[PDB]
Design a protein around this ligand. Structure first.
Ligand SMILES: OC[C@H]1O[C@H](Oc2ccccc2)[C@H](O)[C@@H](O)[C@@H]1O
Ligand SMILES: OC[C@H]1O[C@H](Oc2ccccc2)[C@H](O)[C@@H](O)[C@@H]1O
Ligand SMILES: [Ca+2]
Lengths: 704, 707
């Protein structure tokens, strides 16, 4: 049932280290590789920078003719001689704090204006930033692939070379995320028009959905500026859908070109979204790959994990990300393509004792492989660094292959992983809670994000009051998921899109965090789930609109629900918990015919009910809570206990986190102390008395 | 020369604990006070909530007649019996996570719409947010003062009562900051119009400064919306000046009213600005008090320190804040009105082992007094909690008066303080570096802040490239001040406004972080500083404009500087350091005349020079760096060594922070490990058998030397 990497027909924990040959003295290449191998790592990973190897137009150096660190061929040869597999990442974009993000200077000087990503006025967004589908960009990308891909092909495992995986490009769409700017290149906009024509067929159909007054598709302009009208929201929503198809068109073109060279190894991509040691925005980035993930079963996405520190402040980020990736990519192992080792930023410390706990927590949280990023520090050649001379700090090895504090932490964790991998990789957690992932709430990177300074989405101007980004960050990510992890309740996440009803019935509860809008297919799915015998917890709103904010009351009508939205105090009572702080004055006040009232406003109006529908159960809360008080943890605990869900262990200290991973023969108990306090506690199933240091861990094995 | 509290003509370390009588079973009040006293605390501090005591309009209970915990009079008498002095804070605002920020529900229901803070449309900003100078608000505030102030007066120290200090209101302007919404109440806009007429006298004079074409003062409207023209920037700048006068009028009215009750105790106010464990915005909030601090020498401002954790991620916040308060309030001790104990938010943990280090770091960083907030947890009575039933977590005492883990940390710190306070309060750090505090760069809370959502200031639209908020946050707060602390070079901060040259002349170096604008007074001051023998480090710009973005080239002309602004790679070389990443493509390129070139662009154009001017030295760098790379620390170190400034100690681990504090009698060495690593290091004094020390993660050592 578990998904994991395989070597010699047995479960294999992929342990990779990132070592940038182009940033290391080649006299020390062998020493770096030997020290990486001696930690128990099996794989080494690097970019192959286009700028570094196509030194002038149609002048390629892979042999160190012009600089010894351009000897890619020797580096590949050394990986094989030192018994490491190799991951290669030839771009065209590498990012990696490399000047021009890896594109050649000669290329960026030579490209015409229409090869660049353009703002709505037709101005170049950045001299760094090409249009992914530019004819000229792809032609030059293809000429780079024509040189590097024959080398990669010849050095595949198949041909007793070390190369086992290749990444296509790097964090596709990350520049639109960080800037909050869409590419309005006329070639992109023509592709958007085609998408829209393909989707709606006639202007009459688009007008009926958007409430627009176009006489033809010629009238239609790409959305831009703030959303003022529901028609602007509709247009921006489809513009988000378009970019997900656009990114699939791009990676498909690279993939087909790669396959033409007989490259049959595993293809990868990498997911950004951490910043300042928080990952609450990474689900938005995962959502931009929805069309890639549906159309490429053979491309493995891995996570870029950048925790920076390890404490209760960010403990929930990596679990929530790993669970959402599992939801979106159920047929591949959850792995970290970039797994923090040292720090990209000198002033943002990465402590060995923090990262060691992160590595063990990551195992608890279901990770099946990782690539330490950066295992080895680099020195930027010839000022090719965007920032200073040095690439990364507090790594396992400095750029001269000096061992640093993190080295012995990685060796220790790797030795544990190698000892346990055969059993540990085959373990899962017993989740009786399912949490719905509704991707359209996440489709906002051009209008609502932590990184976008401008707020292009203001739901109150649309006659709404539940903002999807507030819902998905504060009520879901930092609220429910943080709360369940803090309470040591296992959950799984399920992608509600095309979701199999049969997959939902294993769970005792399904939790849906709902705004005022939800498509017909999802309202029908939740209707059928409850009628067939499921237990649904739904808050803060019964939805009444579809994704285009047109009337859709399927779930409301099927459940016999009636409500009025009314203003009250932020505080409610729920299940006899007084003073539960809620996000909104406006709440849903429910008619309680055939219902049990279970939550009350300060004036005793009914803002939550329970109800039997068909064979199933409904709990509807007409208010939004996250986790910002002890009453929130009390309320989640009461909700979980409605359907008699139990934690695996009794642990005497509530502030110890545990994860029980089991298969038929083996149990692992991961204890995690995310607190600056030496804790002593005892545990038993639902002497045995253990002490854990601050920001530390303990793993116990039990045979069944 | 140190400023410290004095008790009976001796240095006194003010150690207070916050204990909310209104949130504690009154049968347990005495036990809370006894346990606070047993930590060596000398004072207890509490809000007196208007909502709690004026239970209905004109129905007052201070005696526990309608609820036992309304017995303020008994709580005061218990403070006296348990030998604790008392700080009282009757508002009218208390915030304190109390429903309606302390204002009575009956008041907010009764007030007419023109008592509230309004947006530009005339919509109520928040049902909890009054207009400070609303006639209706002040009439009810005065009726509240009429009942609580006679009690406070009767129980003052000079009448043998325990009350020694009183806070006026609570964090004035904290609501205008957090919403980024200014009050457009007609009372406020009318006061602004009077302020503008008084400032400019004639519409012609205002039009000459702003470059506007108004026919009369009646055509001038309060600024709103984004700044698009230099005229919009001028209007918003005067609007900021007006709000500083507005807050001074509010506090002046409360002060005048209080003094009429015969209340002669020390008056206080409290500075907000920490959020998410970072204080980089606090200097903006303290700048909103510029006019109060000039007009009220007798109101002592204290800091509200909320670090949440204690690591390299926030190590520089408390020192930079303590130094900036000293700069604005040099005649009073640096103290924390609210000094984090436990956590206001269940999900935001406060570890005893973090806060213990914070307490010791605060001593190293020159704190002279504090009020542990919260010493005692509370339980909100009668649904009065804004956010939940429980007030604070992980405190020294739970609501029931049980000792929690933090209790023994506070007792340990208090014990050291009581043993050492006689010498420690008198100790100075030898600062040879002075950093200039240029208040106008901070005057942006209506247009540019971490908390404002809609950014109104875009300097590029004004033909500028150096944003004053980016400068003061990243180049100064997270850059130079962070860098000096990390490198263990002592610095002082000086307010450049009405700054006496004689106060600058004691330093080996003055560091000025400059935007393209700076007033004529400050350009003249810095000119005279260098001519008379001062050593000035100035970056990233020679300014060429005044506070209204009109021509002012005084400093440029006095220093014989010629420059052109040119685009280049972010990276420069400086003092032989290659690949120094700088914030901007645009750099100042200086003529080499009568100067040594010491920094070069990628085209080897000159973007920094050193020169001798009169008896002084000038170092100008035409590029912006904070601390986002190792090269930045190398550059700060190089600049400091230009005048042969030395650290107090050789320490074998550069990641150990230290402060040496000394007087004639005593030397204290404070070592601070802001890192999750057990560190073993050695040290010795820079002049004149190295000592070895092992320090735990996130921990401290203090060494006392006699002589
Ligand atoms: O911290 C923001 C992002 O920082 C990087 O991405 C960029 C891309 C362009 C410029 C700067 C950072 C990382 O690759 C990405 O994983 C991360 O989420
Ligand atoms: O963390 C934001 C602020 O949080 C509080 O301020 C408010 C004011 C109003 C509403 C909520 C918090 C603290 O008193 C203040 O010191 C702090 O800077
Ligand atoms: Ca019904």
């Amino acid at each position: 049932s578990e998904k994991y990497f395989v070597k010699n027909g047995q479960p294999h924990f992929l342990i990779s280290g990132e070592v940038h040959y182009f940033r290391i003295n080649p006299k020390l290449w062998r020493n770096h590789l030997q020290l990486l191998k001696q930690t128990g790592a099996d794989t080494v990973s690097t970019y192959i920078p286009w700028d570094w190897h196509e030194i002038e137009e149609d002048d390629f150096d892979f042999e160190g003719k012009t600089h010894p660190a351009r000897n890619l061929i020797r580096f590949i040869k050394l990986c094989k001689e030192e018994n490491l597999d190799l991951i290669v990442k030839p771009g065209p974009y590498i990012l990696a704090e490399y000047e021009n993000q890896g594109l050649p200077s000669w290329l960026l000087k030579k490209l015409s204006k229409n090869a660049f990503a353009l703002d709505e006025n037709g101005n170049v967004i950045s001299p760094d930033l090409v249009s992914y589908l530019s004819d000229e960009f792809l032609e030059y990308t293809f000429k780079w692939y024509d040189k590097v891909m024959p080398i990669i092909s010849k050095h595949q495992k198949e041909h007793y070379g070390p190369i086992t995986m290749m990444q296509l490009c790097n964090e596709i769409g990350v520049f639109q995320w960080l800037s909050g700017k869409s590419d309005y290149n006329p070639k992109v906009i023509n592709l958007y028009k085609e998408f829209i024509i393909q989707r709606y067929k006639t202007i009459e159909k688009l007008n009926s959905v958007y409430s627009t007054n176009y006489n033809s598709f010629d009238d239609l302009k790409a959305p831009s500026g703030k959303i003022k009208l529901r028609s602007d929201y509709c247009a921006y929503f489809d513009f988000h859908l378009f970019f997900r198809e656009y990114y699939n068109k791009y990676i498909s073109i690279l993939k087909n070109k790669i396959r033409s060279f007989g490259i049959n190894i595993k293809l990868t991509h990498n997911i950004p979204g951490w910043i300042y040691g928080n990952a609450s925005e990474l689900p938005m980035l995962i959502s931009t790959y929805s069309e890639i993930m549906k159309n490429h079963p053979d491309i493995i996405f891995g996570l870029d994990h950048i925790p920076e520190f390890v404490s209760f402040r960010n403990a929930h980020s990596d679990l929530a990300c790993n669970k959402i990736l599992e939801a979106m990519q159920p047929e591949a192992p959850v792995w970290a393509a970039e797994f923090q080792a040292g720090t990209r930023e000198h002033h943002v410390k990465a402590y060995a004792k923090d990262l060691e706990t992160f590595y063990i927590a990551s195992l608890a949280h279901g990770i099946k492989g990782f690539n330490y990023y950066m295992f080895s520090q680099g020195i930027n050649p010839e000022g090719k660094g965007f920032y200073g001379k040095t690439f990364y700090f507090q790594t396992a090895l400095d750029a001269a292959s000096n061992k640093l504090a993190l080295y012995d932490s990685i060796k220790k964790v790797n030795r544990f992983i190698r000892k346990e991998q055969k059993d540990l990789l085959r373990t899962n957690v017993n989740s009786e809670i399912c949490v719905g992932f509704y991707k359209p709430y996440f489709f906002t990177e051009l209008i609502s994000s932590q990184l976008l300074k401008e707020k292009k989405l203001n739901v109150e101007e649309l006659g709404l009051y539940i903002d999807p980004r507030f819902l998905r960050e504060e009520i879901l990510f930092n609220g429910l998921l943080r709360g369940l992890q803090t309470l040591n309740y296992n959950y799984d996440v399920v992608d509600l899109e095309n979701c199999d009803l049969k997959s939902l019935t294993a769970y005792k509860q399904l939790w849906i965090t709902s705004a005022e809008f939800m498509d017909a297919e999802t309202q029908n799915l939740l209707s059928e789930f409850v009628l067939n015998g499921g237990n649904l917890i739904l808050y803060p709103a019964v939805p009444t609109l579809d994704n285009y904010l047109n009337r859709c009351e399927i779930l409301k009508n099927n459940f016999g629900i009636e409500f009025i939205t009314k203003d009250s105090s932020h505080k409610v009572s729920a299940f006899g918990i007084e003073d539960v702080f809620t996000a909104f004055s406006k709440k849903q006040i429910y008619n309680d015919t055939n219902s049990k009232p279970i939550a009350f406003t300060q004036e005793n109006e009914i803002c939550g009910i329970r109800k039997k529908i068909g064979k199933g159960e409904l709990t509807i809360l007409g208010f939004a809570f996250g986790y910002t008080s002890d009453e929130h943890l009390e309320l989640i605990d009461k909700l979980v206990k409605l359907n008699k869900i139990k934690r695996e262990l009794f642990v005497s200290d509530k502030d110890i986190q545990f994860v029980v991973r089991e298969n038929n023969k083996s149990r692992y108990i991961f204890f995690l102390n995310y607190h600056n306090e030496r804790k002593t506690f005892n545990y038993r199933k639902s002497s045995e008395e253990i002490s854990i240091a601050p920001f530390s861990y303990k793993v116990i094995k039990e045979n069944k």
